[PDB]
Ligand binder design. Structure first.
Ligand SMILES: Cc1ccnc(N)c1[N+](=O)[O-]
Ligand code: NI
Ligand code: NI
Length: 330
């Protein structure tokens, strides 16, 4: 019920936060893992907004209120949580820093915010589940069900007193940024990714791809969102493997619910089918992750380290399948 709002203590605390100096260098890198720095996550987001967009892009009080309320509207689910949000935002920061002048000031601020917000109020259930069991959300949002909800949650947070970080934009730019954010969040529906990547691959290979063409821009931005959403697969192996544990924890909980409603879940969501996970990851990397980072690297050459890391992780899943895995901690 309702939108959660941070405390005075929470946002005033973030305002006074200072990022440890050693992390300034690390945060610029694609492979940076926020994992070991939980207390710093909101501060890391402020830092990234300030470096990409400028210290005066948003009023500081409103930005800190906005961030801490965003955190409060992520649920305590195993994967689609606050940590995922900040991780996705950091990948976007790294893509933007490496491609800075391709994107307008409006796009950069919109996208970093879009990434922080893109899974807002996720309940640990897939679009598949919501539509199968006719959740009210599936009635309201016929396609891209959770993503339309996440966007709606974003707008609800902006509408809280003192939270509207975009108010100082012209009426035209304000409309433009909300549209950038809407399209970006909707694009995190993996259903849409397959069509988008295919089209972009075609536009690229024929050389019709043109970033001055708004519809092309929207599609490139869409693939950036996919690349950021999936970036757990671009980290160092132990990080990728630990995150995969959280992804599956969520899946198995959904699968358990389906069994109670008389439907056998897909194997991926079946906790009694963990033997199939390594092959399932192989499938996911071959079908989704590798093609994504492949096309993204063609369009944005500086993103190549995402693709190299993804390939290294595919090799690791292959090693698992062959029985070559070494000691793992969880
Ligand atoms: C969405 C998804 C599904 C299966 N395996 C994954 N690694 C994954 N992912 O990366 O988010
Ligand atoms: Ni999502
Ligand atoms: Ni996500």
């Amino acid at each position: 019920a309702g939108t959660s709002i941070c405390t005075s203590e929470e946002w005033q605390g973030l305002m006074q936060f200072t990022l440890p100096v050693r992390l300034c260098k690390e945060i610029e890198l694609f492979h940076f893992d926020i994992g070991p720095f939980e207390n710093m996550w909101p501060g890391i987001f402020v830092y990234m907004v300030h470096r990409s967009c400028g210290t005066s892009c948003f009023e500081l009080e409103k930005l800190c209120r906005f961030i801490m309320s965003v955190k409060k509207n992520y649920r305590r689910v195993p994967y689609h949580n606050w940590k995922h949000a900040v991780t996705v935002a950091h990948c976007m920061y790294a893509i933007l820093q490496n491609n800075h002048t391709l994107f307008t000031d409006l796009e950069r601020k919109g996208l970093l915010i879009a990434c922080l917000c893109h899974d807002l109020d996720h309940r640990g259930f897939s679009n598949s589940y919501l539509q199968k069991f006719d959740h009210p959300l599936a009635a309201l949002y016929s396609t891209s069900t959770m993503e339309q909800h996440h966007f709606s949650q974003t707008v609800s947070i902006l509408q809280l007193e003192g939270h509207n970080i975009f108010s100082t934009l012209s009426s035209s730019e304000y409309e433009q940024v909300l549209e950038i954010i809407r399209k970006a969040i909707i694009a995190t529906d993996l259903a849409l990714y397959f069509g988008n990547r295919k089209q972009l691959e075609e536009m690229y290979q024929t050389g019709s791809l043109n970033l001055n063409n708004q519809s092309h821009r929207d599609r490139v931005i869409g693939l950036m969102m996919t690349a950021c959403d999936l970036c757990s697969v671009t980290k160092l192996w132990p990080v990728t493997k630990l995150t995969a544990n959280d992804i599956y924890a969520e899946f198995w909980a959904e699968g358990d619910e389906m069994k109670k409603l008389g439907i056998q879940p897909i194997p991926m969501m079946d906790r009694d089918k963990k033997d199939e996970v390594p092959q399932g990851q192989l499938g996911f990397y071959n079908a989704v992750a590798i093609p994504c980072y492949t096309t993204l690297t063609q369009i944005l050459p500086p993103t190549e380290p995402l693709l190299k890391a993804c390939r290294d992780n595919l090799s690791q899943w292959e090693k698992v399948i062959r029985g070559e895995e070494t000691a793992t901690w969880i």
